């Protein structure tokens, strides 16, 4: 009747998260609120990254998030950068930056 | 065919909530799904390690909270913890 996602006010699949937690060998007993909490954290991070990438792609006259702007957002946000430090986004490119020493004048 | 599965629908819903008009391509959607899966794996592993440390046979909301604290840098941790606690409080009231 009521999905736990809508019950908690979340969009992510609390039920799928609970299933994955109890089937991933993480523990022998998954708390009632553990999957809700995990889904909430995942939704928060996803909303952050999606908003940043959206307004990074819309800053380039586009209307569709692409890997380039996803990478731009992930590398411009100091928190998301520390989070996904050793991660590489395919087709993301690099940040435009030329060292002053290499630059002329 | 099989049934490969992903959070594409929920990622698209959150994308509509944050930017009602800004879409997302298939490559970007796959990258976001991979990111979600990796974060899920890391948080769940940290929660299981915390449970093993505390000799608890269960991973609870408090374990998830401490795992998020041990991974997110500062303001991100403080915001994710607030989101998780609010979600669990709203869930417990229904």
């Amino acid at each position: 009747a009521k999905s736990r996602s809508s019950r908690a006010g979340l969009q992510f699949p609390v039920g799928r998260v609970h299933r994955l937690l109890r089937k991933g060998n993480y523990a022998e007993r998954v708390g009632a609120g553990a999957p809700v909490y995990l889904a909430a954290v995942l939704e928060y991070l996803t909303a952050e990254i999606l908003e940043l990438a959206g307004n990074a792609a819309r800053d380039n006259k586009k209307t569709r998030i692409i890997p380039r702007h996803l990478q731009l957002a992930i590398r411009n946000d100091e928190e998301l950068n520390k989070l996904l430090g050793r991660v590489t986004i395919a087709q993301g490119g690099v940040l435009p930056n030329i060292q002053a020493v290499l630059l002329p004048k | 065919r099989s049934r490969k599965e992903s959070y594409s629908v929920y990622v698209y819903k959150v994308l509509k909530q944050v930017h009602p008009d800004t879409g997302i391509s298939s490559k970007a959607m796959g990258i976001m799904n991979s990111f979600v899966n990796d974060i899920f794996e890391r948080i769940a592993g940290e929660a299981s390690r915390l449970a093993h440390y505390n000799k608890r046979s269960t991973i609870t909301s408090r374990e998830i909270q401490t795992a998020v604290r041990l991974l997110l840098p500062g303001e991100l941790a403080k915001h994710a913890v607030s989101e998780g606690t609010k979600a669990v409080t709203k869930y417990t009231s229904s």
């Binding site: 952050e48 940043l52 800053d59 006259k61 928190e79 | 909530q17 944050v18 915001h79």
Partner: peptide, 23 residues
């Protein structure tokens, strides 16, 4: 929506208004 605190919300709205004004 709530994504992050002051230094992110306002800076993000400013970045959004940037290209809107430039257009």
């Amino acid at each position: 929506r709530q994504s992050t605190a002051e230094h992110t919300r306002q800076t993000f709205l400013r970045v959004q208004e940037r290209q809107g004004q430039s257009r």
